[PDB]
């Protein structure tokens, strides 16, 4: 099998192209390798907001292996343990929420790295990451291989932008709608011109980095103002969501 | 708890009611759960062509307990300790495949009754269907809420439409045109002009028998016309299809 | 569906009744059914000191779900993304180990509630909490829903007991006879008396404040004292106890 | 570890020790292992009635391995490719339902016998029966430590006792009261006279033939009665049923 | 994704190439995707004499997906039902244990092929075998991509071997030695010569019949002599064995 | 059964006898249930580095129960709630990370023991560690059984040798030479002196101290080179790592 890590994930964020992204939130991997024949640039296993263990997340990336969208995991928490456990299984891309801080983010990649420039402990070799070593020279290899990707999700968080988007390691950063309407006050209203306005400059603001800007718009023709306010890394429906959807969407036609 | 047997979905059936229903294809008690908030009037378990074992079986039927929607179990094959497994678990209306022949009908019904009338093995007080003992007199309530469907799949099954028909025990007898096609000597894609005619007459033939007529109709249109025909337990789609087309849809919106 | 939240124990609670209660200690979706059919008024989901996984908790919620008991979940510690996990699979009744301080009981309940009162994540509606967005309205109706319970356990719990009484959002303050024993000097077997009237006026105080004051008492003659104490949410014995002496009972009549 | 197989279950029915046992029903390993403490000669993992797979069977054969109660297995059917299943995970001890016929059960034996004397496929050298070849010459110990228990349930299999008894490989005859009494047109009461009659002659008639006689009685008057008329391997509840009994009793203190 | 159903080990097949393989004897998918990193050219994934569920098939089936071993699945026998399962789940490769006749070759085929030249039920469709249809025209493409192989292992199926041979779609016949030595009257007895002749014979005729033959070797000096002697699909060890001697040669290093 | 906790493996480091180990990274039960047969001394259930669930590290304990060697479980992390876990279930011998400083070390001894001494939380009574009771007066036992093992893996752990080596209730100090290596500035390029002086020097120092001490060695020579110098804990292999060469080495004998 082949000795080199890959990450076309990051490659295409490197090059600014835009992908287009699902979130996987039913913890299965049988739906998961469904999703997979879509061919969506990327899937996102919820592992903060689905009941995902660290073996439903192993079984969903196994389940999507074989195939062109390339997984992105988010654990519960980015805490050293958790970034851990989801590295060692061979996930390359990571999602990680409540990102408030500069120093916060700095710890997120330090999490990720082997000395000299982390605290990561070694056993990536005697495991998924390496692929039991078929994977040579993983050390050398690895951190170009990583996409890091960060939330901001609080008004800390969008105080702090630029702080966060200087810091050596971060890929990306994402915006939640939902959860950065709810912190500025306008819970389930997202849509709320106030929350709009500072979605724009945010995004702008974070391209002007040389990062990649990443949001959830679960309705179309928000992902699409998003799209053309900048963000390149966007996830455009939820699995579940379009599942009830197409379910009820059927029915009304037997009962109605 | 209700020390009482009861089966919605039989009695409705009984009176002749329509009911709408969902295949259930992914084995798994986390997306039949979500498939249960929908409200279909029931929900086809599939154990036939998804691979569940009999604890996913019993998965579901714990996940769709509390909704409104009914389960309907199809087991792998209608053998005589098939049939007691899911009887055991209590699923109550069962859908069972390839029933070619009267004789393999009466079979059928002697597997799901209790000796001396039939061949079903004792043990409900220590399974979920007497629920482990608070259904009070299992026995005597159990044969009124059970509800048999038999699949017509082939040739030799039309054939002998008439005299399964006859057949005490039987509740429904269901027509998946798809298995029909193949048996006449066509394909899957796009139906087939050429069997329609066969495919309504058997329809209006059972209703005629007193039986309720079954039907899967993955196309719309053909739902509405099988309804039309007399068919009164129709399932209109598969979740994992319609799951499948509602993410190809969406992601249509963003690429080209 | 029904799109409203509801939670019959903590409207009981409320009300001043007296609940009784069985600790569920096998991780097992299994069990967990059948211990429903007995009619405890609520059942607890021990995700403490038994090793269930999140997913272990979901199907213990998903096979009680049907019955009348209501269920009760514990999670390994209440951290920030331990109660994240709980609240988003629907648990509505939280009991908390380990709260020592007034200060921590704040943080909980901060943990169980949106920005920007609090710090729960957002992410419900796709989640089993709001059904898929079947409830409607779910970030207005959650916290009227949403019942929280907290364990003295040590001699510093104790000390603060007045100040823990006085944080808002708590609804009941348990105490489990074990844990406060050991702290205060005194091992398992045999409940000593020395400890009984600091656990009986703490008892009485938690009532004194108009909270719910919570029990775990594994012999009947204690927990007949406590409820004359005023406890009003107590758990009466723990299943696998109650499984292991029903079997060495069975098993004696039949031995020497 | 030791290279020779051993079966003390077994050894004891040769000796004509009375065996005291418990119907395992949950499919739980957990359960299983707390079953085992309890110190019943043997524990029955129902296979037939419980929803168990092989992997359920497997689960609980490795949690109850470290204690002194010996493990039985019943598996859903006694067909040669379900009795292979269960061989070659290391059950030596298998009680086969519904066995009508002295040809029955010659084919019964066949199925777990290798050539010259049975039609056993190779395959448990790598398997746990003969713990990955740690037991070595398995082919040549393996029938001596194999202990095989027919059930009679019907008219015809008590009719044909005496040929059942006279089949080589055949260890012991249990009659389930609870099958019987069906058989017989008495369902759901095996205390009727003449259902005693029969199980009482039927005992002695099984152990006039040197062979052991195994009874499943719930009540302890019933399974009392079976031992004094020389019953030896014996079970003496369900494990389910004592959950659930002690549960109602428990909860009965407070209710009433 | 890819419309055309692709069978690399049936085509390697067809051009008479030598395939090396291993067994997977633990069930689990964790063991399947590290030897999948090994490049074998297949991999036989054991339903007959290792505990595999119909979902641990499925799991191994997606952990070995994205490599460049194919995986063959041997059910637990070559039942419809049976094959059914396994052929919908999307294992291409088939191994049938047991098959003695031509007869029995033509049933096993028949089990394979849509009606109405087959017994195969309709349904694939909405199964990962047409990946969620995916694959269009499934019925059209699926004979050419399927590989059957038998398993001709018993005194009876020897005598039958050039009838069976000529049953059309019948690709390959696998010789297990170990079976076959049983059969022919030297269970593990030493009396080789005669069953060395046999295997040599019966591996040139299956090669002069224009199919291909099959072997297992787990001494590396008779998977030698086989392939010199025409079998081109040899499996070549067993994984759990080679596991266990590699812990026992590590462990003797420090020990006696 | 027996009412007193025994631990062998602590039993054997008291007598500083040497104890040969294997590292399991597969997280399955049934490859540990394998590894187990092979006689090593103890077997590390790696939770750190492979991505077990508690419930897998209670299944590889049932697993290995019934055998000679002993099982040591390292956690994710040596938290209070995640020692809390592992106690529960009935490790006895715990392996913890990255313990860098005493006070460290003396908060990982609280954890693992009950108030007022420490901060382990009550309830192992109903949980395997007590055997769900039978084993009398658990509290009083318990230290005398626990083994506890710590991970001083960098510079900072190092300096701080001769602290941790002083604390009460550390009984082992255990050296991961890749951690080491990097930590000291050497990840992978080798400058091994160094490393070499101080693995020696370190390990001399731990058993001067009086405590056991350990280290992983996947390379024989370097193994036997640790025992030289003292080592009395010594994992020999990684399973997976043992497998996947044993894999290769018997595919390379029919391949390049």
Not at 58 to 74: D, E, G, K, N, T
């Amino acid at each position: 099998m082949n000795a080199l890590l890959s990450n076309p994930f990051k490659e295409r964020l490197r090059k600014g192209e835009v992908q287009i992204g699902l979130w996987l939130s039913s913890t299965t991997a049988y739906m998961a390798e469904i999703a997979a024949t879509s061919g969506y640039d990327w899937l996102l296993i919820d592992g903060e907001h689905a009941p995902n263990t660290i073996q439903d997340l192993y079984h969903q990336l196994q389940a999507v292996a074989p195939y062109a969208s390339q997984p992105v995991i988010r654990p519960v928490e980015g805490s050293k343990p958790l970034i851990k456990q989801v590295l060692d299984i061979g996930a390359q891309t990571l999602l990680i929420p409540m990102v408030d801080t500069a120093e916060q983010a700095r710890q997120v990649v330090s999490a990720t790295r082997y000395p000299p420039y982390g605290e990561r402990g070694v056993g990536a070799s005697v495991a998924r990451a390496a692929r039991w070593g078929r994977i040579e020279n993983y050390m050398a290899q690895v951190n170009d291989s990583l996409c890091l990707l960060v939330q901001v999700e609080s008004k800390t968080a969008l105080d702090n932008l630029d702080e966060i988007l200087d810091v050596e390691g971060i890929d990306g950063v994402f915006i939640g709608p939902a959860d950065l309407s709810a912190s500025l006050g306008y819970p389930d209203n997202a849509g709320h011109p106030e929350v709009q306005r500072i979605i724009e400059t945010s995004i702008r603001r974070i391209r002007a980095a040389g990062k990649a800007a990443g949001f959830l718009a679960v309705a179309p023709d928000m992902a699409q103002q998003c799209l053309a306010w900048g963000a390149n890394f966007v996830a455009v429906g939820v699995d579940t969501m379009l599942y009830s959807d197409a379910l009820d969407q059927r029915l009304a036609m037997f009962k109605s």
